[PDB]
C-alpha cells in the first residue's frame, strides 16, 4: 500500500500518538541503550582546561505504540524531518561547555523503526568538554578525560540509561594525536547524580592519554644541558681572564633564568612544583654555584706561593667534581620519575 | 483518564488560561523563590574584567489558575515544549555580558506542577558576568564577584523576588580553580533598582575569591632576589676588574628593567601602584645603588696610600651593609602586607 | 471587564488597527522623544578603532488609534510578546558595527500605553560603535566618542526624532573605567543626513574621555630616564676603561631602541609623530651623543701633556653639561604639553 | 481610500501577483540599475588577505505588474515586512567571505514603488571581501581592492545588471584610513562569468589604496641607519681596544639580524624579495664588512714599522670610504623606487 | 498556460508528490552525479590542522515523478524557495569541522528540471576541513588534502554517489596561494564506509600542495649561516684577546639556541625530528666546537717554545678545517633532501 498513508496512519492525530507521553506512562522505566562512535579527537588545551571532540551518538529504546505488523518490510528507514513527532529522551552532557549540530546540506540525523517497536536514533554532534588536569609530573603525565551523559528532566522511575553489552565505544581507524597517545582500554562506570529535585541517571566514559616526550626533549631538556656544559667550560679558562669568566657566568645565569621563565609559557598558573621546575631549579643552582666558585677563587688569589697552589687546587677539584655530581642528579631524577609515575 | 486530554483541558482555550496575565491580575504581588546550583566556575580574566559561570536556575511561584484536584497524582512532571503556554517571570541579569541556552539534544528545561498550584521551573544557563576588581595588593588580593537578578518589566506591585530560606546557593562537589580558592560563605543581600520608569525588584549574591601565591613566588619574586644576589656578588670581585664589574652592573640593571616591564604583561593598564611594583622598584633601586657604589669607588681610586685604604673600606662596608638593609626591607614588606590585607 | 478581551478588542482585526500604517498617515510628522540609560561602558581599543557599550533605550510617541477610555486604569503595562502588532519607529545606529538583543530568560523589552494614547517602549541593547581617534598628544589626550541615532526608511515628512528636555543621558552609579575618566558634560546636538534618496532625521551624543597618566609614567617615562642616568654614569669612569665604556654605550643604545620600538606595541600604525615619539627620540639622541663624546675623548687621548688636560677637560665639562641640558628639555616639554593640550 | 485595502488589493491572491515569476516571464531581460554608498572602510589585513566594508546597496528595476494609477500619491513608501511578497533579484558577491544583515531595532531595509512600476530597494550590508595583494615594493605599494556583484541563478536571457550613469559609487564624508589613502577615481568595468551551467551577469568596482610611509620610516628605516652609524663609530676607536671593537661588531650584527627578522612580523610568508628585505640585506652586509675590516686590521698588526703604517692607513681609508659608498647606495635606492613604482 | 498553475499542479497535494519518498521507492538505487567548482582556497594552518575552502557543489539525479511533457520549454529554471518540496539527497562531509550557507541577499541556491525528469541542484558552501599532515621533511614537504562526501542516512540499496566522467573538479582562474602551489592533477578514488548500522556510499578527492622555499631561505637558513661564519671569524683574532673570543663564542651560542627555539614558533608540538631541526643541531654543534677549540688552545698556551708553535698550529689547522667540513655537510644535506623527498 501507498507509503505516504502508512506514516501518518501510524503517527497521526487519527492514531492518537502523543510525542509528549512516554512509551509506558505509568509502568516500568524506559531503558535506553547507547553507543558512541568517535570520528575526530583533538584540540586539547591546558590553558582553557578543555578538549574538543566530534562523535556519533546512537540511542535505542522500545516504543510499544509504534509496533507495526501489516507493512511487509521488517525494518523501515524514515526521513529526518519527522523527528519532532516522536518521543525522544532528553539526554544532556553534564561536563559540556559548547555544542552544535550539523546542517551542512541536510540535518545529520537518522531514524529507524522495527516491527517489534524498537527505535534507533543516530545524531552527529560536536562537543567541547571540560577536563580537570593534574600538572604534577608535567612532562611525564597521564591524563584522564571524562564524558558524562545525563537526563535533565526525568527521574529514575521514568528513564534509565545503560551501556551496550558489546562495543559501547569504538574509535575511527587511523585517528592519531600530535602530542598524545590514546589508550585502547576505556573504563565504563556508573554515575548517579543527586540534587534537591530528585535522582537522575548518569553514565560516564574515561579516556587515558599519555603525553609524548620528544617535543619536550628537543625543546627544553637539551638546551639546559648545553648551558650547564657551557658554564662548565669556564673551569678550563685561565684564572686571570676575569672579564671573560664573569661575562660567561652572567650570560649563563641570565639565559638559564629566561629559559626557566619561558618553560611555562603555555600552561595554567598552578601553585605547585612541577618536574620541569625542579629541573630548571637544579640547573640554575649549578650555574650559580659555578659563578660563586670562580668568585671564591678570585677572592683567594689576591690575598698577598701557598695562596697560588690553593686556588689552583680549587679549579682542579671543580673540574672533576661538577660533572660527577650532575651525573648523580641525572640518575636519581630519571629513575624516580619512571617509578613515582607508575 | 487519558493523559493527553487533561493537559489541554487545564491549559487550553476551552479553559480560558491566558499566559499574558499574571496569577493575580489585581491583588498582592507575586512572590518568586529562587535558588541556584553552580556546576562550573572559571575563566576569570583581569584584562576583560569578566568571569564565566555555568549555573542551574530554579524558580518557584504559586499559580491558582493551575490548581488541579481530579487527577490522582500529587505531582505532575511535564514536557519542555509547553513552556510557551504558561506565564513565566521576566528575570534578567543586570551585570550580564553574554548568555546562551543549551540545546545539546533537547531543550535543557524542566517544569513541574503540584496540586495546590505551585510551579517549579528549572533551566540551564551559561553566563559571562562583569566584575569590578581592585588591583592594589595585587599578589595578595581577595576579590568579590557579584551576580544580580532583576525584573525588566514588572514593578514591585506585581513581582517580588526573594531568596529561599534554606540552601539558596550550593556548589558542585569537587569544583576547584587553578588560581583561586572559593570561600564557603556567600552573602545574601537585598538590592533595589530605581529608574525614571519605576521601582524594580533585585537580588544579589557575593562570592569571595582568594588568589594563590605559589605561581607568583615561582615566577617573579625569586628571580628578582636572584638578580639582587647576583649584583651583590660584584662586591667580592677585584676593583681592578672594571669591564667585568661594569658589565655585571649593566646586565643586572637591564634584566631588572625587563622583568619589571614583563611583570604587568597580563593585567589592565591601571593608574595606581601595586605591591609588585613597589617590590620591583626597590630591587631596581638596590641594583642601581650597587652600580653607583662601584662608580664612586673607581672615581676615588684614581685620585693620585690614604686613597687606597678609603676605597677598600668602602667595599668592606658595602659587603655587610647591602644584605642587612635588604633583610630589613623584606621584614617590613612581608609583615605589613599580612596586616594591611586583613 | 475581562483583561483578555480588551487587548484584542483594541488591537485586533475587529478594531482595524494596522501596524504598517503610521499614527497619522497624511498629516504632521510623528514626533519621537528619546532618552538613554548607560549600564556599562568599556572595551575601548585603539587598534580596532571601536568601543563597546550596553544601554537601555527609551522611545516615546503618541498614537491616537490606541486611545482607551473605558478601562479604569490610567496606565496599562503589557506583555513583550505583542510588540509585533504595534507600529514602531525604525531607529538604527549609523556608526554601529555590531549589535544584539538579550534573551537571557525572556525578551528584555517593555511596553506601556496610557489613556491619551502615549506609548513608552524600552529595550536593552549591546552596541559596538566606531570612534575616530586623533593620536597626537597620545599620552595626554582627550577623545570624543559619538553615537548617532537615525531613521533608515522614513523621511522628515513622516518621522522626526528629538531629545528629551530633561535628563536625555544618565549614567549608572559607580561606573568607572580603568584607563579613562568619563566627563559629566554631554553635548546634545542636531545632525541631519542627506542622500540621493531623501532627507533623514538624526540625533547625536558626544562623550568626553580623558586618559590617565599613571600607567604610562610607571611603564615608559621612568625606565627611559633610568637609561639616560645610566648612560650619564659613564662620565665618572676612568677613560682607560675602554671596553667597559663602549659596552655601556652599546647596551644603553640598544636598550633605548628596543624600548622605543616597544612603546607602540598596542597602537594603530599612524603616520604622524606622537609625544612619546618625541620623548624617545630625544632620549636616544642623548645616549648616542654620550657615546660620541667618549669616542671623541678616546680619539683625542692617543694623539701622541697638552692632549691630557684637553681630554680631561672634556669629561669635566660633560659631567655638568649633560644634566643641565636634559633638565631644560624636561621643563620645555612638560610645560608646552600642558599648554598645547588645552 | 483606506490604505490597508490598496496594499493587499495590489499584491494579493485576489490580484494574482506571484513573487516567483519575473516581471516579463518570456521577453526582454530584466535590467537592474545599482549604486552603492560606502559608510565605513577599514580592517585591511595582509595576513588574512581580506578587508571589511560596510555599504548601502540600492537596486532599481521596473515591474509592470505593480503599476498603480488610482491612488493619488505619485510615490509610495512601504513597510520592510512585505519584502517577502515581491520578486527580488538574486544578487551575490563572488569575492565575499562573510556577510550579515543588521537588525539593531528593525530590519535595515527600504522599499519604494512608483506609479509607472519602478521599484527602489535599499539594504544595509556588512561584507568581508578577499583581495589579492602583491607585496613587491612593500613599503611603497599601491593596492587594488575589487568587489564583484553577480547573479547566482539567472542567465543573461533573464537578468542583466548595469551601473548607474551618474554617481554609481559615493563615499561618506570624512572617511579616513590610518595606513592608507583612498583615491577618488573608481574604475567601473564589465565582467562576465562563464561556467558549465551557463552565462551570468557580473559587475565590478576597483578601489586604489596608497600606503603611507611615516610609520615605516619611524619604525624600521631610521633604527637601521642608527645601527649603521653605530658600527661606523668603531673606526675612530683605538686598534688596541680589541674586546671593545669585537663586542661592538657582534652587538651590531646581532641587532641587525633581529631587526631583519622582526621586519616581517605581520606579513604573509611570501617567497619573493621585498624592498625592505633589500634594505636590511645591504645594512647587514655593511655591518659585517666593518667587522671583517677590523678583523683584517688586527691580523695585519701582529705580523711582527711598515706593518704599523699599513694598518693605520686601512683605518684612515675606511673612515672616508664607508660613508661615501653608503650615500651612493641611498641615492640609487630611493630614486629607482620612485621610478619603478610609477 | 499560466506559469503559476503548472508548478503546484506538478508538485502539489493534487498531484500526490511526496518529498519524503525516493524517486524509486522499491527498485534500483538512485544514482547521483556530482561535480565541484572551487572558488577560493586558503587558510591552511598547521597548528589547527585544518584548511578553509569555498566551493560550488552540483548534484544531478533523475526523478521520474517530475517528468513534464505538456509545457513547451525544454528546460525550466525555478525559484530557490521551493527546494523544501522536492526530495534531495542527504550529502554530508565526513572530514568537515565547520560549515555555513550564504544568505547575502538571497539564498545562494539553484534548481533546474528537464523534460525527462533530470534535476540539477547547485549550492554555495564554505567548509573548514581537517587534514592530517606529516611534518618530516618540513621545509621540503608535499601535503595531501582530502575531502570526503558521504551519505548519512541511506544505505547502498537506496543511494549511490558517483563522479562525473568529464570535469569533476575545476578550479577558478587565477587562484594562487602565498605559501603553496596547487598541483593540476587531482586523484578521484572510491571510498566506502562500514559501520554497525550498515554500508554507506562515499567519494573522495585528493589535492597535492607543494611548499615554497623562499620564505624559509630568507628567514632561517641564511641567518644561521651568518652566525656560523661569525663564529668562524674568531679564528683570525689574536689568541691573547680572551674576553673578546669568549664573548663572541657565548653570543654566537646563545643566538643559535634562540633561533633554534624560534624556528618552531608556528608548528604543532610533534615528537619527531624535522630537517630544520637537523640543520640547527649541526650549526649549534659547529659553534660549540669552535668555542671548545679556543678553550683547548687557551688551556695549552699557559702550560709553561714548543707549547707556542703547537697552539698556533691548532689555529692554522682550524682555519682551513672548519669551512671544509661544513661544505661537505652542506653537499650531503641538500642532495639527499632532493632524493629522499622524491
Ligand atoms: C527496564 O529494565 C529494568 C531493569 O531490568 C526492568 O525492571 C525489572 O523488570 C523485570 C521484568 O518485569 C522485573 O521482574 C524486575 O523486578 C524489575 N527490576 C527492577 C529493579 O525494576 C524494567 O522492567 C525494564 N523496563 C521495560 C519497559 O522493559
Ligand atoms: C507576597 O508576599 C507579601 C509579603 O509577605 C504578601 O504581602 C502581605 O500579605 C499578608 C497576607 O495577606 C498581609 O497581611 C500583609 O499586609 C502583606 N504585606 C505587604 C507588605 O504587602 C503578599 O500577600 C504575598 N502575595 C501572595 C500572592 O501570596
Ligand atoms: C510634531 O512637531 C512639529 C514641530 O513642532 C509639529 O509641527 C508644528 O505643529 C504646530 C501645531 O499644529 C503648527 O502650528 C506648526 O506650524 C508646525 N510647525 C512645523 C515646522 O511643522 C507637528 O504638528 C508635530 N506633530 C504631531 C503629530 O504632534
Ligand atoms: C533591457 O535592456 C536591453 C538592452 O538595451 C533591451 O534590449 C534592447 O531593447 C530594444 C528596445 O526594444 C531593442 O530594440 C533592442 O534590439 C534590444 N537589444 C538587445 C541587445 O537585446 C531590453 O529590451 C531591456 N528590457 C526591458 C524589459 O526593458
Ligand atoms: C544506478 O546504477 C546502477 C549501476 O549501473 C544500476 O544497476 C544496474 O542496472 C542495470 C540496468 O537495469 C542492470 O542490468 C544491472 O544488473 C544493474 N547492476 C547493479 C550492480 O545493480 C541501476 O539500475 C541504476 N539505477 C537507476 C535508477 O537508473
3-state SS, one letter per residue, for chain B = CCHHHHHHHHHCCCCCCCCCCCCCCCCCCEEEEEEEEEEEEEEEECCCCEEEEEEEEEEEEECHHHCCCCCCCCEEECCHHHHHHCCCCCEEECCEEEEECCCCCCCCEEEEEECCCEEEEEEEEEEEEECCCCCCCCCCCEEEEEEEEEECCCCCCCEEEEECCCCCEEECCCCCCCCEEECCCCEEEEEEEECCCCEEEEEEEEEEEEECCHHHHHHHHHHHHHHHHHHHHHHHCCCCCHHHHHHHHHHHHHHHHHHHHHCCCCCCCCCCCCHHHHHHHHHHHHHHHHHHHHHHHHHHHCCCCHHHHHHHHHHHHHHHHHHHHHHHHHHHHHHHHHHCCC
The answer to whether the CB of A243 is under 6 A from ligand 1 is no
Q: Could you tell me the distance, in angstroms and rounded to a whole number, from the CA of residue E37 to the centre of ligand 4?
A: 32
**Contacts of residue E288 in chain A, CB cutoff 8 Å?**
226, 230
Last residue before each gap in chain C (C to N over 2.5 A): 304
Q: Are A94 and A202 in contact (CB under 8 A)?
A: yes
* Euclidean distance between CA atoms A303 and A299, whole angstroms: 7
* Euclidean distance between CA atoms E88 and E59, whole angstroms: 9
Q: Find where cell 535558588 sits.
A: B35
Q: Report the CATH number at residue D133.
A: 2.70.170.10
Classify residue D38 as exposed, middle or buried by CB count within 10 Å of its CB (0-12, 13-18, 19+): middle
Total domains, chain D: 2
Q: Smallest Cα–Cα separation from A180: which of A135, A213, A205?
A: A213
Q: Tell me which of B233, B253, B257 to substitute to probe the interface with A (most A C-beta atoms closer than 10 Å).
A: B233
Say yes or no for a CB contact (<8 Å) between A90 and B81.
Answer: no
Residue of E nearest to D245 (CA): E244
Q: Are D11 and D36 members of one domain?
A: yes
Q: What would the grid cell of residue E55 be?
A: 566551493
* Euclidean distance between CA atoms D239 and E260, whole angstroms: 35
What is the separation of C-alpha D174 from the centre of its chain, rounded to a whole number of angstroms? 19
Q: What are residue B185's phi and psi, to 5 degrees?
A: -85, 125
Q: Are E177 and E221 members of one domain?
A: no
Q: What would the grid cell of residue C91 be?
A: 531607529
Give the three-class secondary structure for C52: strand
Q: Provide the shortest C-alpha distance from residue C241 to chain B (in Å).
A: 7
Write the secondary structure of chain A as one string of H (helix), E (strand) and C (coil). Answer: CCHHHHHHHHHCCCCCCCCCCCCCCCCCCEEEEEEEEEEEEEEEECCCCEEEEEEEEEEEEECHHHCCCCCCCCEEECCHHHHHHCCCCCEEECCEEEEECCCCCCCCEEEEEECCCEEEEEEEEEEEEECCCCCCCCCCCEEEEEEEEEECCCCCCCEEEEECCCCCEEECCCCCCCCEEECCCCEEEEEEEECCCCEEEEEEEEEEEEECCHHHHHHHHHHHHHHHHHHHHHHHCCCCCHHHHHHHHHHHHHHHHHHHHHCCCCCCCCCCCCHHHHHHHHHHHHHHHHHHHHHHHHHHHCCCCHHHHHHHHHHHHHHHHHHHHHHHHHHHHHHHHHHCCC
* Euclidean distance between CA atoms A71 and A3, whole angstroms: 9
- Measured from the Cα of A160, ligand 1's closest atom is 1
* Euclidean distance between CA atoms B288 and B282, whole angstroms: 10
Residue among D88, D243, D292 whose CB faces E241 most closely = D243
Q: Are A109 and A122 in contact (CB under 8 A)?
A: yes
Q: Are D163 and D188 in contact (CB under 8 A)?
A: yes
Q: Are A77 and A191 members of one domain?
A: yes
Long-range contacts from D4-7, C-beta under 8 angstroms, 24+ separation: D4/C16, D4/C18, D4/C20, D4/C21, D6/D68, D6/D70, D6/D71, D7/C20, D7/D78, D7/D82
Q: Taken in order C44, C46, C47, C51, is the CA torsion positive or negative?
A: positive
Q: Are E28 and E137 members of one domain?
A: yes
Q: Are A52 and A131 members of one domain?
A: yes
Q: Provide the shortest C-alpha distance from residue D72 to chain E (in Å).
A: 31
Return the partners of chain D (3 or more C-beta pairs < 8 Å). C, E
Q: Are A198 and A247 members of one domain?
A: no
Residues flanking ligand 3, CB < 6 Å: C 24, 28-29, 31
- Measured from the Cα of B23, ligand 2's closest atom is 27
Residue among A92, A260, A264 whose CB faces B108 most closely = A92
Residue among E132, E195, E243 whose CB faces A241 most closely = E243
Classify residue A265 as exposed, middle or buried by CB count within 10 Å of its CB (0-12, 13-18, 19+): exposed
Q: Are C197 and C317 members of one domain?
A: no
End-to-end CA distance of chain E: 66
Q: Are E150 and E92 in contact (CB under 8 A)?
A: yes
The answer to whether the CB of A251 is under 6 A from ligand 1 is no
* Euclidean distance between CA atoms E160 and E148, whole angstroms: 14
> Ligand nearest C63 Cα, by number?
3
Say yes or no for a CB contact (<8 Å) between B215 and A269.
Answer: yes
Say yes or no for a CB contact (<8 Å) between C237 and B246.
Answer: yes
By most ligand atoms within 8 Å of CB, the mutation choice from B22, B26, B27, B28 for ligand 2 is: B28
| Burial per residue of A231-247, b for 16 or more beta-carbon CB atoms within 10 angstroms, e otherwise | bbbbbebebebbbbbbb
DSSP state of C220: I
* Euclidean distance between CA atoms B234 and B297, whole angstroms: 13
Last residue in a domain, options B179, B211, B243? B211
Q: Are A315 and A279 members of one domain?
A: yes
Note the maximum CA span of chain B.
Answer: 117
Q: Are D130 and D256 members of one domain?
A: no
Q: Are B102 and A92 in contact (CB under 8 A)?
A: yes
The reported resolution of this PDB entry, expressed in Å, is 2.8
Q: Tell me which of E258, E271, E276 to substitute to probe the interface with A (most A C-beta atoms closer than 10 Å).
A: E271
Q: Smallest Cα–Cα separation from E125: which of E100, E105, E107?
A: E100
Q: Tell me which of C20, C101, C195, C249 to substitute to probe the interface with D (most D C-beta atoms closer than 10 Å).
A: C20
Residue among E104, E233, E247 whose CB faces D93 most closely = E104
Q: What would the grid cell of residue E62 be?
A: 533523475
Say yes or no for a CB contact (<8 Å) between B91 and C82.
Answer: no
The CA-atom distances, in angstroms, between B284 and each of A259, B243, C257, D39 are 22, 21, 20, 51
Q: Could you tell me the distance, in angstroms and rounded to a whole number, from the CA of residue D150 to the centre of ligand 4?
A: 20
Q: Which residues pair with B163 in a beta bridge?
A: B34
The answer to whether the CB of D323 is under 6 A from ligand 4 is no
Q: What would the grid cell of residue A66 be?
A: 509504534
What dihedral angle (degrees, nearest 10) is formed by the CA atoms of E62, E66, E69, E72? -100
C208 is in an annotated binding site: yes
Residue of B nearest to A123 (CA): B105
Last residue in a domain, options B211, B242, B259? B211
Q: Provide the shortest C-alpha distance from residue A231 to chain B (in Å).
A: 16
By most ligand atoms within 8 Å of CB, the mutation choice from C24, C25, C28, C89 for ligand 3 is: C28
Q: What is the DSSP string of C106-165?
A: S--EEEEEETTSEEEEEEEEEEEEE-----TT-TT-EEEEEEEEEESS--TTTEEEEE-S
Give the three-class secondary structure for D133: coil
Angle CA(B261)–CA(B265)–CA(B268) in degrees, nearest 5?
110
Give the three-class secondary structure for D132: coil
Q: Could you tell me the distance, in angstroms and rounded to a whole number, from the CA of residue D156 to the centre of ligand 4?
A: 12
Say yes or no for a CB contact (<8 Å) between E153 and A104.
Answer: no
Q: Find where cell 549609523 sits.
A: C94
Q: Provide the shortest C-alpha distance from residue C48 to chain D (in Å).
A: 8
Q: Are D16 and D130 members of one domain?
A: yes
Q: Are D202 and D249 members of one domain?
A: no
Q: Could you tell me the distance, in angstroms and rounded to a whole number, from the CA of residue A31 to the centre of ligand 1?
A: 9
Last residue before each gap in chain D (C to N over 2.5 A): 304
- For chain B, the C-alpha Rg in angstroms (whole number) is 33
Write the secondary structure of chain E as one string of H (helix), E (strand) and C (coil). Answer: CCHHHHHHHHHCCCCCCCCCCCCCCCCCCEEEEEEEEEEEEEEEECCCCEEEEEEEEEEEEECHHHCCCCCCCCEEECCHHHHHHCCCCCEEECCEEEEECCCCCCCCEEEEEECCCEEEEEEEEEEEEECCCCCCCCCCCEEEEEEEEEECCCCCCCEEEEECCCCCEEECCCCCCCCEEECCCCEEEEEEEECCCCEEEEEEEEEEEEECCHHHHHHHHHHHHHHHHHHHHHHHCCCCCHHHHHHHHHHHHHHHHHHHHHCCCCCCCCCCCCHHHHHHHHHHHHHHHHHHHHHHHHHHHCCCCHHHHHHHHHHHHHHHHHHHHHHHHHHHHHHHHHHCCC
Last residue in a domain, options C211, C240, C272? C211
Q: Provide the shortest C-alpha distance from residue E16 to chain D (in Å).
A: 22
- Measured from the Cα of E29, ligand 5's closest atom is 25
The CA-atom distances, in angstroms, between C108 and each of B154, B157, C104, C123 are 11, 19, 8, 6
Last residue before each gap in chain A (C to N over 2.5 A): 304
Residue among E154, E291, E298 whose CB faces A238 most closely = E298
Q: Are C30 and C156 in contact (CB under 8 A)?
A: no
Domain with E182 in it: 3-211
| Burial per residue of D240-257, b for 16 or more beta-carbon CB atoms within 10 angstroms, e otherwise | ebbbbbbbbbbbbbbbbb
Q: What would the grid cell of residue D154 be?
A: 539567472
* Euclidean distance between CA atoms B70 and E172, whole angstroms: 71
Q: What would the grid cell of residue B45 be?
A: 580574566
Q: Tell me which of D153, D200, D244, D260 to substitute to probe the interface with E (most E C-beta atoms closer than 10 Å).
A: D153
> Ligand nearest B162 Cα, by number?
2
Note the maximum CA span of chain D.
Answer: 117
* Euclidean distance between CA atoms C167 and C35, whole angstroms: 7
Q: Smallest Cα–Cα separation from C143: which of C168, C180, C95?
A: C180
Q: Are B92 and B175 members of one domain?
A: yes
Q: Report the CATH number at residue E317.
A: 1.20.58.390
* Euclidean distance between CA atoms A291 and A61, whole angstroms: 73
What is the separation of C-alpha B146 from the centre of its chain, rounded to a whole number of angstroms? 9
Beta strands D75-77 and D109-114, pairing class: antiparallel
Amino acid at each position: 500500500m501507498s507509503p505516504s498513508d502508512f506514516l501518518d496512519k501510524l503517527m497521526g492525530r487519527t492514531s492518537g500518538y502523543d510525542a509528549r507521553i512516554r512509551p509506558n506512562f505509568k509502568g516500568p522505566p524506559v531503558n535506553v541503550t547507547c553507543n558512541i562512535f568517535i570520528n575526530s579527537f583533538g584540540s586539547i588545551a591546558e590553558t582553557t582546561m578543555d578538549y574538543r571532540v566530534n562523535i556519533f551518538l546512537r540511542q535505542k529504546w522500545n516504543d510499544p505504540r509504534l509496533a507495526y505488523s501489516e507493512y511487509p518490510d521488517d525494518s523501515l528507514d524514515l526521513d529526518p524531518s519527522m523527528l519532532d513527532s516522536i518521543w525522544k529522551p532528553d539526554l544532556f552532557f553534564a561536563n559540556e561547555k559548547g555544542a552544535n549540530f550539523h546542517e551542512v546540506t541536510t540535518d545529520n540525523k537518522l531514524l529507524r523503526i522495527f516491527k517489534n517497536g524498537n527505535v534507533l536514533y543516530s545524531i552527529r554532534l560536536t562537543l567541547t568538554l571540560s577536563c580537570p588536569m593534574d600538572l604534577k609530573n608535567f612532562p611525564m603525565d597521564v591524563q584522564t578525560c571524562i564524558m558524562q551523559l545525563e537526563s535533565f528532566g526525568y527521574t529514575m522511575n521514568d528513564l534509565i540509561f545503560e551501556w551496550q553489552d558489546e562495543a559501547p565505544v569504538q574509535v575511527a581507524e587511523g585517528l592519531t594525536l600530535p602530542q598524545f597517545l590514546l589508550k585502547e582500554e576505556k573504563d565504563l562506570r556508573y554515575c548517579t547524580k543527586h540534587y534537591n529535585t530528585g535522582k537522575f541517571t548518569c553514565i560516564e566514559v574515561r579516556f587515558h592519554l599519555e603525553r609524548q616526550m620528544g617535543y619536550y626533549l628537543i625543546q627544553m631538556y637539551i638546551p639546559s644541558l648545553l648551558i650547564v656544559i657551557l658554564s662548565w667550560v669556564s673551569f678550563w679558562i685561565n684564572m686571570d681572564a676575569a672579564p671573560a669568566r664573569v661575562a660567561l657566568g652572567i650570560t649563563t645565569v641570565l639565559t638559564m633564568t629566561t629559559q626557566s621563565s619561558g618553560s611555562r609559557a603555555s600552561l595554567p598558573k598552578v601553585s605547585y612544583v612541577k618536574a620541569i621546575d625542579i629541573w630548571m631549579a637544579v640547573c640554575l643552582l649549578f650555574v650559580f654555584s659555578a659563578l660563586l666558585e670562580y668568585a671564591a677563587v678570585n677572592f683567594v688569589s689576591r690575598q698577598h706561593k701557598v695562596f697560588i697552589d690553593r686556588a689552583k687546587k680549587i679549579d682542579t677539584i671543580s673540574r672533576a667534581c661538577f660533572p660527577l655530581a650532575f651525573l648523580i642528579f641525572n640518575i636519581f631524577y630519571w629513575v624516580i620519575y619512571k617509578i613515582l609515575r607508575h
